[PDB]
Amino acid sequence: EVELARLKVQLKNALLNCIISYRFHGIGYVLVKTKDTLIDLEQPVNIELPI
């Protein structure tokens, strides 16, 4: 529950700016960061627990 609560805090922080960008521009993007390298972002994800 502690790790999930920290994840929820970061999710809220991301969602605030996501909604702000949705209202100002028309679209908002939130990246779900996992335990991967910068080049691995291109590859798809099957099942993972986000960082």
Binding site: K35, D40, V45, N46, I47, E48, L49, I51
Partner: protein, 111 residues
């Protein structure tokens, strides 16, 4: 015979101890490739320290890491083909070893 016989029986004991040592080295190789995969590819929340604090046997830790790695790398179709079922919650064993070998191949080709 006699004195030398008992010393050669102690030598047989040495053979047994060497067999145990080789078995430990095999454990080293297996469990260690597993731990390298776990650290390199899985979250910090699945660390052995926190899992042991939550109270899981180390074999449970290794099988959980293996299952997470298989779900992360091996596709669901490959799981449903090799393991014959989608759920991996009851597939620990030799089939799990095959699945983690496939996951190692997957990460090797991914790099």
């Amino acid at each position: 015979l006699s004195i030398n016989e008992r010393i050669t029986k102690e030598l047989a004991e040495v053979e047994e101890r060497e067999r145990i040592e080789k078995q430990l080295l095999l454990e080293a190789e297996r469990i260690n490739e597993i731990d390298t995969l776990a650290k390199a590819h899985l979250s910090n929340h699945f660390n052995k320290e926190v899992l042991l604090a939550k109270g899981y046997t180390l074999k449970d830790i290794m099988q959980a890491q293996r299952r997470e790695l298989v779900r992360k790398f091996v596709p669901i179709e490959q799981i449903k083909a090799i393991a014959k079922v989608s759920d991996i919650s009851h597939i620990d064993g030799e089939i799990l070893e095959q699945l983690v070998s496939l996951a190692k191949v997957n990460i090797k080709l991914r790099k």
